[PDB]
Amino acid sequence: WPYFIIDLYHWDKHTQKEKGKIALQVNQSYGLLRDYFELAVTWANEEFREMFHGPLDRITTYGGPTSEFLKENGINEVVLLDPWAEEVLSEKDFDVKAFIIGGIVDTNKKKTTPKIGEELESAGIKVRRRKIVLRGDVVGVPDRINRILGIILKMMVEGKSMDEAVYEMQ
Numbered sequence: 229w230p231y232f233i234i235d236l237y238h239w240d241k242h243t244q245k246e247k248g249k250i251a252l253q254v255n256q257s258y259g260l261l262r263d264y265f266e267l268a269v270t271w272a273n274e275e276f277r278e279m280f281h282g283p284l285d286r287i288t289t290y291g292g293p294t295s296e297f298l299k300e301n302g303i304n305e306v307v308l309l310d311p312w313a314e315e316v317l318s319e320k321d322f323d324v325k326a327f328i329i330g331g332i333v334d335t336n337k338k339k340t341t342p343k344i345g346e347e348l349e350s351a352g353i354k355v356r357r358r359k360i361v362l363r364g365d366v367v368g369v370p371d372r373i374n375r376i377l378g379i380i381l382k383m384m385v386e387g388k389s390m391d392e393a394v395y396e397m398q
């Protein structure tokens with residue numbers, strides 16, 4: 229029912245190995261969403277589709293900006309899964325029409341995803357920066373795209389709590 233968007237921002241700024249890991253995690257994110265309830269990939273260029281070893285027919289890919297995709301569907305506010313926020317994702321945010329997970333990997337961590345929110349705000353989009361915590365700290369929370377998507381799904385679909393959802397995906 230809602231939109232799980234993967235923001236392929238910073239795509240051409242990653243190495244070939246890192247590009248493959250992003251395409252792998254998006255593939256695993258689809259198969260995970262396949263066993264639940266819808267997966268969107270913005271900034272989805274030709275190279276991503278070339279590296280995506282899954283069915284392009286089964287997901288929604290848009291080569292343009294994420295903000296354009298949100299406007300083209302009437303969505304004015306989203307939830308940005310961001311480990312750098314100070315407010316934690318709660319059931320009060322399960323009413324938004326789209327959840328955004330930035331297609332980002334690491335090699336040591338940097339502070340990248342809040343720039344996606346700054347870009348969405350500059351395009352006139354209400355953004356709810358929400359962090360996923362385990363016992364108050366983000367340490368121990370798996371930060372892979374497919375793991376983050378699974379944590380949210382166990383909370384929305386299966387009604388688990390955040391601590392239970394994080395540990396089961398951990």
Ligand SMILES: Nc1ncnc2c1ncn2[C@@H]1O[C@H](CSCC[C@H](N)C(=O)O)[C@@H](O)[C@H]1O
Pocket residue numbers: 308309310311328329330331332333334337338339340341342358359360361366369370371372373376
């Ligand atoms: N603790 C957390 N809470 C919410 N989202 C998280 C998260 N950990 C990882 N993610 C999601 O997983 C994606 C890639 S992990 C992000 C890598 C980098 N260290 C950074 O934070 O910028 C991000 O887009 C983010 O939305």
